[PDB]
Symmetry: D2
Subunit: 291 residues, 4 copies
């Protein structure tokens, strides 16, 4: 049993005219609120206790949209991050929550998708001790955090915003840790930008020499929706595969269902209140079979 | 001098998993909040006094995003619609605001765009006496309120979601009314659907013979963003013409500027706070010229 | 060992201004000629002897683009269909070619794609006796040939463009036949539409009780590129998953390579002559591995 | 009265797996063959005598698709360019055709579109003597031909593939000349790449000091469809504005019609043979009016 956290705060300045009003994580990726995506990841990893960190201003909107999470058969807790001081701060803010157990942090503006992702997730979630990060092959390795490594990964360097070289495997917003995490967090100096950067915490695990690295292969898709254009690419992608290939991405009630987290009765209440929606029919359709 | 109102409430059920958290009118059409679009219309019509009607829950989000409107050189007032009882209700709720003057109602989920649009708005705006609705040839007449008319228009009929024929021109969410408007709305009774329909207010100017129709010809684009798919079509469209043809749609500060509503100094404060955005550079670029 | 045929003729009237010049099957689905797609299917089914039936006018263009097929490690033969008299005619025209062996017909304007597809093809291919058609749940049953079936399938019926009901599974342009095939095609008479329909050949295996159905489940995508809009949907789809998920669809040299049909040396000559292309680099990249 | 030429040859290597079979200019930009676009430009400029230069292999396909051009009320002549030796060669190859008159060259892979383009065209086509080129604002001024200038343009430098600076106004595939053109062409040395580059000919006019420069403003869209990705952008663009804004781009019969080049009777024969197509209905619809 492990716990999960989702950073759903931030000022989201790069989407600015828009995020001046509503939190970036409430914006839509096709037919589902953005936060539905990072959440589904944690659920595919089999994590039911999840703390969502948001700004004081957006909180009620998230609660208004997710409630206590009982609708998805999960236990949701909320916590406010007063000012956007950096990612590492999640562990400080989430100390009392994590207690002393191991965790999983997922950035709120990240979309992940590939065949047989759930397993890969579980396996890595079977690691008591250490720290795993998920790299992805980028074409623009400068404007992304890079991680080097060799057989067994281990990682030999985590040069972020490399001034010139490194490797081309960017590290995504999917992190796994262990107890020592609240520790490393408590000691972290504000970056030039001026925020407790999660990279600093990952640095420590590298030297401590227990920073394994999970490889996200070819069939895997990864996006960091935080700019006007990437927000569109994300939407268009999900819409394309959902309509073209017949399955839904980040459909929470469906993930819960199969995970035995909620009974057919539960899925039916959901599909009903969404019946007028393509998301709802997709749910009604799962309530049967073909020849 | 005329006044404008924008219906920005509603339950937005057709976009449901999403609108369970944030109002539909705060969602993005590419790089701008949806409401930026109906608003720009009123501004292109030369209207500075605008009342925005929203739900009690979303209000602060709108204020948080639009303020008093001084940033766009316009006078914004807000009012709450307790429960989504229909469109005609805007005039009831907006009585004290309209006072006795003529008005312009624009639905919050409507995107309008074409060349020469404004001149067409001013002309239709310069009228003081009657009512004015715009048609657009839809391909789904059933699913739209339709206007049959004759020479000069007038409109012999106006059948709602005509389960059968009519004509193929749908009535867009753009309307112009005179003082008799608030009078009408008070005598509208709930449709079979249970809301107070704007169509009723229109069936009244029809009979009174005071109902002119304005045709949204060929080069104009019209959308009613209220479904998951139309929300994407809208976004993709604005992104395509903005990037392909070089201008911005519904860029408020730019509309204000040319309208002499705000000085270069004003446009510069804006473009600055958006500098990290494509919307911002577009603004910086207008602050000059080419050979 | 089995043989395959690809119908790549037709008048392609629905894409008309365009197909007045070039055959529909030479048009592009993103970065590859349309015909590359039906072909890859046959290759994924492990079929190396393939007859391509084209019009007399387009022939040299196909040869000019595909040659004898040695570049993809396959044996290509060509044959001309004088006039577009229907699909069943492929077996007549292809008699001398098929000889007495079993076959596989794939329409030229069909795009197929899903995970685990091949294994499914081999299994359906390993059969020697009967007939095999694939269904895909369309949303437009009228506009498609449909298959009603029961447990194991069989198919109780097969109504063409059923002006009324049936089921919602459309018969894709992928078929498997045995020697009795050419026998059937000879006794097919022209439909009301005036062509010799493949459906007729199918109605014959139905009655004979030798007609199995293969369901193209959820993760599979299917398209019939023959209209201006579906041609765009297809392109946009392949481009999206290729760029989003990192693999190439219908990349012949790559299919050949893994099938042991062509050596690394072969793949390198190809990737070289395409080096200036994204298709080429994808090939160079397969010529190695990662940690 | 002036003459026009369209370079529709080339090896089109950047679209390679595809162009190994069919000429790039026969590929589709949505619902119309690519060549329909450059052609429409010449027609919007009011030019009826047009020479199309193609490869020996593609010729019959173009003829098969365009005939003598009488269907669009224009006089089409064809000429073969044996080997793709460069653009300047058009004037050599087209000497006997141009005779001694002034001309207009339009590259075959260029798509142009903006409101009030036709006028701008005509005006520039009213220039006997000199040479006009059309620049467009690019964001990637390196991989494009640049042109500097000041009041009256004149152009002060034509640095192509600038190793480092210049201006950001790329020059498009739309050129206008005068007699002295066959002259300048006859004397041109093969570039490093190894082809008679049109840029070399434009150089001469700059020094001769009679190389005016037409400015393609904001609302204008320009694309150079010669790569897999730009081919898709082009299609998606045309499809978007055509469906979103209700008009057709590069609809030849319609351009002829208004130009008085072909009578209603002619447009009706066309719309008929395309009736099953969206292009055809668009034509039937122009054969009337609304209230
Ligand atoms: C900086 C910060 C980010 N976040 C969230 C926001 C994102 O979902 C995710 C990644 O941060 P970013 O992707 O940087 O998003 P952002 O909110 O910082 O906005 P921008 O950089 O464009 O101005 O982490 C917090 O929850 N708290 C924080 O202090
Ligand atoms: C019914 C109603 C709509 N509106 C707004 C919402 C829309 O922008 C616009 C048009 O109404 P709709 O487009 O119908 O939107 P909606 O909010 O009713 O949601 P849905 O029909 O999908 O369930 O009017 C109000 O502001 N108050 C209302 O009572
Ligand atoms: C009718 C016919 C089709 N074909 C091919 C064309 C297609 O790839 C495939 C399916 O036929 P269609 O998809 O019908 O294509 P088509 O060429 O008939 O053109 P349209 O219906 O739009 O006018 O079979 C032949 O090869 N020979 C034929 O006689
Ligand atoms: C080089 C050349 C190009 N053309 C045409 C092709 C194009 O429409 C246009 C522009 O040339 P390009 O855009 O360079 O096209 P291309 O055919 O050279 O192919 P690529 O560069 O990708 O390998 O001019 C000729 O007609 N004859 C020629 O000799
Ligand atoms: Mg981010
Ligand atoms: Mg609506
Ligand atoms: Mg077909
Ligand atoms: Mg080019």
């Amino acid at each position: 049993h492990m716990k999960g956290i989702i950073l759903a705060g931030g000022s989201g300045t790069r989407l600015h005219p828009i995020t001046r009003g509503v939190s970036k994580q409430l914006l839509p990726i096709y037919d589902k609120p953005m936060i539905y995506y990072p959440l589904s990841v944690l659920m595919l990893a089999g994590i039911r206790e999840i703390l969502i960190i948001t700004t004081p201003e957006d909180k009620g909107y998230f609660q208004r949209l997710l409630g206590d999470g009982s609708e998805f058969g999960i236990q949701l807790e909320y916590a406010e991050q007063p000012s956007p001081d950096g990612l590492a701060q999640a562990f400080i803010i989430g100390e009392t929550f994590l207690n002393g157990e191991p965790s999983c942090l997922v950035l709120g503006d990240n979309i992940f998708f590939g065949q047989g992702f759930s397993p890969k997730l579980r396996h890595v979630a079977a690691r008591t001790e250490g720290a795993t990060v998920f790299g992805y092959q980028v074409m623009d390795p400068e404007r992304f955090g890079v991680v080097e490594f060799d057989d067994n990964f281990r990682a030999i360097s985590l040069e972020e915003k490399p001034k010139q070289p490194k490797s081309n495997w960017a590290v995504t917003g999917l992190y796994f840790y262990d107890s020592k995490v609240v520790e490393y967090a408590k000691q972290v100096k504000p970056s030039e930008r001026g925020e407790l950067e999660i990279t600093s915490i990952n640095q420590m695990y590298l030297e401590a020499g227990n920073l394994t690295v999970e490889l996200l292969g070819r069939g895997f898709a990864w996006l960091d929706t935080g700019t006007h254009d990437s927000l569109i690419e994300a939407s268009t992608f999900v819409q394309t595969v959902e309509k073209r290939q017949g399955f839904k991405i980040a459909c929470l009630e469906e993930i819960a269902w199969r995970n035995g987290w909620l009974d057919d009765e539960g899925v039916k209440r959901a599909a009903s209140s969404l019946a007028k929606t393509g998301y709802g029919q997709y749910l009604l359709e799962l309530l049967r079979a073909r020849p």
